[PDB]
């Protein structure tokens, strides 16, 4: 039990420390600006759209090279639940709410990205195989 | 939830329409020398429609019961300043 407590503590510390992250802010938008985020950026692994306090959180979709949309998983993060973190870095995004559509453009898309050697969202936390077998 | 309804007009009536039209054309051709349609309709007529609702549509949930959050949250005051 003592080893597990220290392991959990170190895991949370490493998740929160978040060092060595490069941020991309070259994002443009064009469409229905009333559902627009106040900010959008990506850290190399996820893309975050921060919305204001009064704005309804819209639905965000993944646009490929032919223009077709597909669902992308998202997690709602931030202290006031104002940020939507989508689990992919893509050049073009589509934001929808009701009958309004806004297209977000990544103007500095890095195709290479940074590899996920650890299995977690962090470069300082490993995911190890417990089940053995 | 509601959206755009597809009633399948051709899949329901095209067999009967085409059967009747070919029958009339055949009659005209045979006369110019000088029921299948109902049975197709009986089979193709009962095709339920299909609803198409796009993504990003706004909807509601009308809570049908009492939801109780006593066990998962509690309230504590934030001390002043």
């Amino acid at each position: 039990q003592t080893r597990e407590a220290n392991a959990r503590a170190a895991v949370e510390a490493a998740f929160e420390q978040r060092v060595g992250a490069y941020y991309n802010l070259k994002y443009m938008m064009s469409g229905d600006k009333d559902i627009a985020p106040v900010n959008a950026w990506d850290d190399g692994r996820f893309t975050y759209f921060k919305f204001s306090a009064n704005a309804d959180l819209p639905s965000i979709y993944f646009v490929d090279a032919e223009g077709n949309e597909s669902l992308v998983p998202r997690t709602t993060v931030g202290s006031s639940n104002n940020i939507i973190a989508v689990h992919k870095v893509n050049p073009k995004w589509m934001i929808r709410l009701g009958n309004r559509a806004l297209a977000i453009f990544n103007e500095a898309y890095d195709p290479n990205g940074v590899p996920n050697d650890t299995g977690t969202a962090s470069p300082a936390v490993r995911r190890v195989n417990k089940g053995g077998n | 939830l509601g959206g755009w309804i597809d009633r399948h007009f051709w899949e329901r009536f095209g067999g009967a329409i085409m059967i009747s039209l070919i029958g009339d054309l055949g009659d005209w051709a045979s006369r110019q020398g000088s029921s299948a349609a109902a049975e197709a309709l009986r089979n193709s007529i009962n095709i339920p429609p299909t609803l198409y609702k796009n993504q990003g549509e706004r909807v509601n949930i009308l809570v049908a019961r009492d939801l109780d959050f006593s066990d998962v949250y509690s309230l504590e005051s934030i001390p002043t300043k």
């Binding site: 064009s30 985020p37 900010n39 950026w41 975050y48 929808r96 | -």
Partner: peptide
């Protein structure tokens, strides 16, 4: 003869940066 409509496609004219200011989550 009829097909299910596509959703609204945003206009591609009023293209402007999303970020007027750097977010505080970047700590900048």
């Amino acid at each position: 003869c009829a097909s299910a409509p596509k959703p609204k496609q945003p206009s591609d004219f009023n293209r402007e940066p999303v970020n007027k200011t750097v977010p505080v989550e970047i700590q900048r």
